[PDB]
Design a protein around this ligand. Structure first.
Ligand SMILES: Cc1ccc2c(c1)[C@@H](c1ccc(F)cc1)N(C(=O)c1ccc(Br)o1)CC(=O)N2
Ligand SMILES: Nc1ncnc2c1ncn2[C@@H]1O[C@H](CSCC[C@H](N)C(=O)O)[C@@H](O)[C@H]1O
Length: 319
């Protein structure tokens, strides 16, 4: 259980994630006080306990993986076993004695595990949430922007620096490094900063989690067109995608994974072009992006940089 503890350690050590959930939940104290909550995928149980601190009478903490033992332990240890009930197994088959006033979950991320988690939360909403019940978070939004990855630039430049240190010219391996690091069709999860961002980020989709038939909409695919204009001269390496989610308040609380906001464990998802393309101030960058489900979540991208012809590059997540 090494990667098992590391995953839960990583989440809890993310103060942006954890304070956002804590405040997001607490700020609904008036709607939660004395009410019932389902925590879908409770993990170590911290979100369920946040709900109790907000005043919930009963929280059902449903967890499919072995970490539920630790959740049971943490709740019992905090003396909340009367108010938080840890239930092992998948949410799709759990039996609650009542329908709930609110659902909390932390389903977001990049890959098949997270897609499966949203589906499970939507299954639970339809099955167990009362009409007009609270969803925490309630919505998500997806953003895209052209980027220049400084770390990648260094790695691509590395082979040209070997001569200076060891008297052997390996500059000829730039082509090789580029093909290997950029020519694949995988999504790369990497943390960027604001200076990597080459234009204004564009929202390309919104997911309102209360909508019935969202499961159906997701299966078709989520996304849309985008357009933007670059800020200055740079080697454009591709696009970054990220999300935010919103907790209703009475101003809503936003948990964001943007490169301009504090770093989170989610980082951003990078879509590299096959090789770098030079952009300038006012270079138009436009395209269409679609995220959809051999069991793979495909990212379909068609884009145009400047006067270049439109190009397709499709990526995938097999997990
Ligand atoms: C079609 C679909 C279905 C479920 C679904 C996704 C996409 C998205 C998603 C992630 C976060 C959100 F706030 C919203 C959506 N997910 C992705 O992997 C993803 C996003 C960008 C790239 Br690149 O990949 C998995 C997920 O958490 N949920
Ligand atoms: N169908 C399902 N039913 C119940 N739990 C699930 C599930 N699919 C995944 N999970 C669990 O959901 C968790 C997501 S990790 C989030 C953990 C916790 N809510 C926290 O915020 O700290 C994992 O621990 C995983 O085992």
């Amino acid at each position: 259980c090494y990667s098992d503890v590391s995953v839960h350690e990583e989440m809890i050590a993310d103060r942006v994630r954890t304070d956002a959930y804590r405040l997001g939940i607490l700020r609904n104290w008036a709607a939660l006080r004395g009410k019932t909550v389902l925590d879908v995928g409770a993990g170590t149980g911290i979100l369920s306990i946040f709900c109790a601190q907000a005043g919930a009478r009963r929280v059902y903490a449903v967890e499919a993986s072995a970490i539920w033992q630790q959740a049971r332990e943490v709740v019992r240890f905090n003396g909340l076993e009367d108010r938080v009930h840890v239930l092992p197994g998948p949410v799709e088959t759990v039996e609650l004695p009542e329908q709930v006033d609110a659902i909390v979950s932390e389903w977001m991320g990049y890959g098949l595990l997270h897609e499966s988690m949203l589906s499970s939360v939507l299954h639970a909403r339809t099955k167990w949430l009362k009409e007009g019940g609270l969803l925490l978070p309630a919505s998500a939004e997806l953003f895209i922007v052209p980027i220049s990855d400084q770390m990648l630039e260094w790695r691509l430049g590395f082979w040209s620096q070997v001569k200076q240190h060891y008297g052997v010219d390996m500059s000829c391996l730039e082509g090789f490094a580029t093909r290997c690091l950029m020519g694949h069709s995988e999504i790369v999860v990497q943390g960027l900063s604001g200076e990597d961002v080459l234009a204004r980020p564009q929202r390309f989709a919104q997911l309102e989690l209360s909508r019935a038939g969202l499961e159906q909409e997701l299966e078709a695919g989520v996304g849309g067109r985008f357009r933007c204009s670059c800020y200055g001269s740079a080697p454009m390496h591709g696009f970054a995608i990220w999300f935010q989610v919103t907790f209703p308040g009475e101003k809503p609380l936003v948990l964001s994974t943007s490169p301009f906001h504090p770093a989170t464990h989610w980082k951003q998802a990078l879509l590299y072009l096959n090789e770098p393309v030079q952009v300038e101030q006012d270079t138009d960058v436009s395209g269409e992006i679609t995220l959809l489900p051999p069991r793979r979540l495909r990212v379909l991208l068609r884009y145009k940089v400047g006067d270049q012809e439109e190009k397709t590059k499709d990526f995938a997540m097999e997990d």
